[PDB]
Amino acid sequence: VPTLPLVPXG
Amino acid sequence: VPTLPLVPXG
Amino acid sequence: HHMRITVDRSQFFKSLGRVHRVVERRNTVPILSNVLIDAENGSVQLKATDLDLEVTESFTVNIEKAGAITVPAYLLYDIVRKLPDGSEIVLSVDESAMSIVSGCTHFQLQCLPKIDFPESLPGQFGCRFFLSASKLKHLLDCTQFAISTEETRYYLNGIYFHIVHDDVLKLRLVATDGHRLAQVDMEAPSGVDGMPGVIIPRKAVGELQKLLSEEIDGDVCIELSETKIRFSLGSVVFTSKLVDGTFPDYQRVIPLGNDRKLIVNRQDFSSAVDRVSTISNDRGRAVKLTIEHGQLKLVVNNPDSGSAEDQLAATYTSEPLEIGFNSRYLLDIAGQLSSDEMVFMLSDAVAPALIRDNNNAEVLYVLMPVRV
Amino acid sequence: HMRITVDRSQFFKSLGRVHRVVERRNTVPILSNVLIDAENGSVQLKATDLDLEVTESFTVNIEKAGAITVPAYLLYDIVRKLPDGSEIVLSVDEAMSIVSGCTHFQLQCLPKIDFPESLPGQFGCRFFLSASKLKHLLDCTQFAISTEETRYYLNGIYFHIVHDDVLKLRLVATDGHRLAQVDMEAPSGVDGMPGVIIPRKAVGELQKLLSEEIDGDVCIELSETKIRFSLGSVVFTSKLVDGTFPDYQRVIPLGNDRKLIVNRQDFSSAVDRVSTISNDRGRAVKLTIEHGQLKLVVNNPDSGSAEDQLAATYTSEPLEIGFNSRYLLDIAGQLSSDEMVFMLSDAVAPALIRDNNNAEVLYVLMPVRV
Fold first, then answer.
1. Per the CB < 8 Å rule, is C305 touching D95?
2. Residue D97's domain is classified under what CATH number?
């Protein structure tokens, strides 16, 4: 369960 | 909070 | 044999709905979470059990291949609930798993074989008689609410179903939790001479009531021994163990000598009790009735919230009386009655009250007071 | 020594609008109370959890001005049972008395001087949106707000100005898997507006009011520490989430070129059906997408499998991609069109779902491995 490629945090 | 006088039980 | 059946979704959903609720969700024995599906000779039977209560329902289906299988019951119900009304469902076992096909939707469910499922010997019953479903519903409607749910009072956790050898035989149901008591009589149908007094468990009563709430036509065949009772109605059969205990000598608590009569408008009384009890909490639900000529005052006190009072007209010509009751229990009994007039037959402040619809003669309620 | 006579229906409606913000249980008891403050021909009901505050006012001929606080859920439950079309006398004798016909309550109360109030703040930005517009913006974004304690800065909506070829007011919410973005042309008065994170609880309570309100104007005021919404007779004031919202523009895949079109109702119903076998240990649904066709599969090793198949419009390279089935249903439920359009790339790139009926709304959903 990958996260959205949010910077930071993903 | 009395019980009914049930025999047995009260 | 490897089952293959095509069923109407709506018919299957209705029948499954009748059996699946017997399964306990907290149950941990895997086979007991399943519904048995048994297809043979133009009929599909659904069976569920918790070992104390068993329910079966059957319906007519052209069977492509006879066979049986057991399927997790809540999962199967949730699946069928989402399949479209007016569709068909193909249920099939291959060479323990069951396929469910509806349109392009296809489930493969992990199952358990019929041989694992509990099956009883044929019931052996010494007593067999019939009641209309509507009459049985009336008897249970008068008494179910008063059944105990306390684990420490197991033989109060059901309804005492017994014969009263009056001039005319009566069939009577009594339930009590030690505070409320409900008693309903009818003229006994034929075939109940010698019937033992038995305690029908709370769960069987509740499942029977859910079916009866649908307004079932025709009669119920009631069969019993001292160990089991069976209700057959429509295409449904309920078989329940009986509670293994002796019901109390409940006639000792029914006050037939109370000599103070209070009549109130049932709706006005119920709404007033509902209002003043709003401030109650886990400490108790006591409401004090101060009864005077023509007048009833209600008072509730709760140390965590405050106080509440109300007043109603009443018909009352006896010695003034202050008496307390559990407000929820008062609302429970008021909810049982159908007439505009609610009658209390009272004695003193710590003696049981006899309550009824001013009209009727077959049902009575008893309620113990509380100190105020 | 307060004494007021109020109409039951008006009071029930007004109490219903404020009592929802208090928590039922509190270690500081007065925070469970509603402040009833009657003065100058009007009663103000106030409730707070210290972070969010709500006031509602309504006009009343007051017999004796004054104020008192009373437990809010208990008062609401009492008024619920008082007859439609009655009058209620609320009074304090120098406990609060509640009288309705022959019904009389005496409730344990606490004084106004113990109730935590705020000064009227100083706001650097003030502008107006229609209630229906604000409702639209929140409806697009509320579902995607994080509830996770470890992602505190995602526990709200990022409310901010965007300097595009048109100046825009934008709301973004994300929980790290779903993201929602909605824009409108910026109203006048948003020059200099700070970007702020509106807390999840404030959004929820504001939503409840907006749904209970037909068209009117909402005055929005904000600072770097508070935001306030005024509409009709209600004022909602909230602290902000003191955090840094992530650089969300980096997750929005405007380059995805594999277009999948499905019938939204058929897709939603199929996902609902196959997800029936899942539990909380995993909600993945695998989408196998080929020309003109979508297959759905859910596998639960503790229960079995579920498959379905849908017609679709799809002319790109075949793709197998997985999503959380609940999150797919959430985004499908945001839409109103017959069709639902996914813009896809490969199996581990976020999907873009636009609203065919609202060009200014978009949704992003991260896949899961299948």
1. no
2. 3.10.150.10
Per-residue b or e along D179-191, where b marks 16 or more CB atoms closer than 10 Å to that residue's CB: bbbbbbebeeebe
Please give the DSSP secondary-structure letter assigned to residue C193: T
- Residue whose pair of structure tokens reads 């100005």 in the numeric block: D161
CA triplet D208, D209, D213: central angle to 5 degrees? 125
Distance between CA atoms of C120 and C122, rounded to whole angstroms? 6
Residue type at C232?
A: S
CA angle, corner D152, sides to D151 and D156, nearest 5?
A: 110
Find out whether C222 and C231 touch, Cβ atoms under 8 Å: yes
- Verify whether the Cβ–Cβ distance C181 to B4 is below 8 Å: yes
Contact D297, D345 (CB under 8 A): no
The closest alpha carbon to C57, from C210, C232, C209, C230, belongs to: C232
- Read off the amino acid at residue C45: Q
Residues 275-304 of C with CB under 8 A from D: 275-276, 278-279, 304
* C-beta separation of D159 from D245 below 8 A: no
Q: Which residues of D touch C72 (CB under 8 A)?
A: 303
Nearest CA-CA partner of D327 in D137, D154, D143, D203: D143
- Exposure string of D42-59, with b = 16+ CB inside 10 Å and e = fewer, is ebbbbbbbeebbbbbbee
The alpha carbon torsion through D274, D275, D276, D277 (nearest 10 deg) reads 90
User: By what technique were these coordinates determined?
Assistant: X-ray
How many of the other CB atoms lie within 10 Å of CB of C338?
Answer: 10
Mapping DSSP to helix (H, G, I), strand (E, B) and coil, where does residue D139 land?
A: helix
Spell out which residues of chain A touch residue D172, defining contact as CB-CB under 8 Å.
none
CB contacts under 8 A, D 160-189 vs A, are 174, 176-177, 179
Give me the total of CB pairs closer than 8 Å, taking one residue from chain B and one from chain C.
40
Of D188, D201, D175, the C-alpha closest to D324 is D175
Give me the phi and psi of D327, to 5 degrees please. Answer: -70, -35
Q: What is the residue range of D13's domain?
A: 3-114
Contact D151 A1 (CB under 8 A): no
